[PDB]
Each structure stands twice: as C-alpha cells, then as structure tokens.
Unconditional design. Structure first.
Ligand SMILES: Cc1cc2nc3c(=O)[nH]c(=O)nc-3n(C[C@H](O)[C@H](O)[C@H](O)COP(=O)(O)O)c2cc1C
Ligand code: NA
Length: 357
C-alpha cells in the first residue's frame, strides 16, 4: 500500500491514507459553538481520507484555550452538525476528538474554577495566554468523583453521534486529563487509579469502555503521545508504557490507535513505533514530522496503516492531491494558528487557486 491506497478503518472505507490530524484553532464562538468559519475550513479539507476535528470540550467549564469548541450543549450539537454535513456533502469522513483539559484549564479561563487532575501538581514548562500567566495547582480528584468524568465523556460521545460525526477520537495525549493519569510524572496518586501501569491506564480504559458502548468500538480511536514533554509530561519508562498499552488496547477492538511518535520539545527520545506495531494488531495511525516520501515509505513497509498530517494539512487544503503529484506545499504561518478570523484559516490556496484561475 501507499498513501493513496484506500483503507478500511472500522467499517468506514477511507479514500486515501492522507489524514488530517486534530488542530486547535480557537475559531469557535464565545459559547464554544462552531462557526461558519469552521464549516468552510473543514469542508475545504474533505479530500482527506479522514478529518480528525480539533480538541473539543467534553464537559462544561473546562476551557484551556478560551475559544475552543464544545460538544456538551444543544447549540454546540447543532453547530457541529453544520460542519459534518458540509464535510459529508463533499464525500469526506470526520471524527471528533473529545477532550478534557485537566490541569491545563486555568482558573482565569473558567471564572475562577479550580481545575482537576490526578495529583495536585501544576504545569511548569508552559504558560497560558489569557496576559501570559503561570499555570496553577489543580485539585486532586477523589476516587469517588471519577465516575462523573466517565459519564461526561459518555454524554459527549452521544452528542457527537447526534452531531453526525463518523466516530470519535478519545484524547489520551499531550498532557490533558487522560494523559495526566496515564504517565507517572503527573500521576502520584495512590489507590486504583495510581501506581502501576494498569492502574494509571484505568481512567483512559474506563473512558474507552463507555465511548465504545455509545458508538460500537469500530468507530472509536485513541490518541497517545508517550514521549511528548508538552505541559510538563514525562513517563519514567515510555517503552514499557506503550508496550503494555499496545497489548491491552487489542481488547477494545478500536477503529485505530493514533500514535504521536516523538517529542514536541525534542527532549525525550525512544523508538516507540516498533514495539507498538509489533504488539498492536489493529489500525496504526502515525503522526509527527512525516513528509510525503517518508509516509509512503512507512506505509509500504507495513509499519503504519495511515499517517495523520498536522501543519501541512493546516496550510494545504488539497494536501492529498499535492502529495500525489509531488507539488510544493504552501508554507504555514504560525502567527495565525490561534487568532480570530479567516486570515490564515480559510485563505490558504489550492493548487488551482494558486495558478490564479
Ligand atoms: C496549531 C496546532 C493545534 C493543535 N491542536 C491539537 C489538538 O487539538 N489535538 C491534538 O491532539 N493535537 C493537536 N496538535 C498537534 C497536531 O495534531 C500534530 O500532532 C502536530 O502538528 C505534529 O504533526 P505534524 O508534524 O504533521 O505537523 C496541534 C498542533 C498545532 C500546530
Ligand atoms: Na487537592
């Protein structure tokens, strides 16, 4: 196979293996409802084999980025339905990444509410823009409060189904709530959700269980980032962590496992792709730093089943055609990743627009 071979993912048929990774762009409205801009932006990218829509707040009152979308309210379901209808009308496929920001939900973004976490320890290697402010110490969740978080993900997953998505991706990565429980640098707690790997993975696995009850497992993916240092994250043994999870996630019959293979900050290095491919029997989606040539190489070698592209798909609405034809890519402008408005969001050109009609 290569990037342009169709692939089965759950019971969906994806047209190609050029997928769009989830990208927070903070273009939702003040009530966290998707906007006309988001409809146009995702519709422009519907030639992707699959779009994974950006981190979306599962539960009310957990903002980390000010204007991210949510999937807890009726207006949000209706807003997201505009997005999924536009993508389907172009023949694309789209999953929703459902997310709880955990200790990254700064009090100043949430009317003074104290964020929750597996342990009362703040993020220290990143700041929040609100002005630029240090993260605060989160409250340690009691064991008895964890059922309401699981229920919150179940309701988010039911709402995502009503909004017309083809499936959901559970956000188990990048230092947010599920990843904070998973990795021992952020999870110091005792009891059934702390200590050994199987306990630290319990919350993620309990979420996957309820979300699969809503959707059927072949419509649920999970994203993991075992080496990412972002938001003060570390595991003391990432190889053992991903090996255990690769084996255990077979039992959930997921649509896919979406593995970020490296560290945003370049501090933690290990080969996590090899033991994940060896032990995980399902669909392996890889991400981080793939070019078209490398992506074809790793699909053809059998090391991954698909590749999710982040910044290249942000900046190239027609990335699959560009990679197919070996045409130069548009350059991304990081200055507009998180601004408001259409500039740097819906105005990156296609090949044919570039040719100036
Ligand atoms: C502007 C921006 C927003 C992002 N938002 C998310 C997100 O919402 N959820 C997530 O899991 N990863 C997010 N990421 C990480 C991307 O999905 C992706 O892993 C990263 O860009 C590296 O992939 P690439 O090398 O193909 O760009 C974001 C990255 C950027 C640059
Ligand atoms: Na506490």
């Amino acid at each position: 196979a290569d990037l342009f071979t169709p692939v089965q993912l759950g019971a969906l048929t994806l047209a190609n293996r050029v997928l769009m990774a989830p990208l927070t762009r903070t273009r939702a409205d003040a009530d966290h409802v998707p906007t006309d801009l988001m409809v146009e932006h995702y519709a422009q990218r519907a030639s992707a084999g699959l779009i994974i829509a950006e981190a979306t707040m599962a539960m009310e009152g957990n903002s980390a980025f000010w204007r991210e979308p949510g999937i807890y309210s009726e207006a949000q379901v209706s807003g997201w339905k505009r997005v999924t209808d536009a993508v389907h009308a172009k023949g694309g496929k789209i999953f929703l990444q459902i997310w709880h920001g955990g200790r990254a939900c700064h009090p100043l973004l949430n009317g003074g509410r104290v964020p929750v976490a597996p342990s009362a320890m703040a993020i220290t290697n990143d700041e929040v823009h609100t002005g630029k402010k240090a993260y605060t110490v989160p409250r340690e969740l009691a064991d008895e409060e964890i059922p309401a978080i699981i229920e919150g993900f179940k309701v988010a997953a039911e709402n995502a189904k009503r909004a017309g998505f083809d499936g959901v991706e559970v956000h188990g990565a990048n230092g947010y709530l599920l990843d904070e429980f998973l990795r021992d640098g952020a999870n110091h707690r005792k009891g059934p959700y702390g200590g050994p790997i199987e306990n630290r993975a319990r919350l993620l696995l309990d979420v996957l269980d309820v979300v699969t009850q809503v959707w059927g497992s072949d419509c649920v993916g999970v994203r993991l980032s075992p080496l990412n240092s972002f938001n003060s994250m570390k595991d003391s043994d990432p190889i053992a962590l991903v090996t255990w999870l690769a084996k255990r996630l077979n039992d959930f019959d997921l649509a896919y496992l979406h593995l970020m293979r490296a560290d945003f900050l370049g501090e933690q290095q290990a080969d996590v792709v090899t033991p994940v491919r060896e032990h995980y029997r399902g669909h392996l989606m890889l991400n981080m730093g793939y070019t078209g040539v490398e992506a074809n190489t790793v699909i053809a070698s059998g090391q991954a089943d698909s590749i999710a592209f982040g910044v290249p798909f942000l900046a190239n609405p027609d990335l699959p055609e560009r990679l197919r034809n070996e045409v130069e890519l548009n350059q991304a402008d990081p200055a507009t990743f998180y601004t408001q408005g259409p500039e740097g969001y819906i105005d990156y050109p296609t090949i044919s627009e570039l040719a100036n009609a």
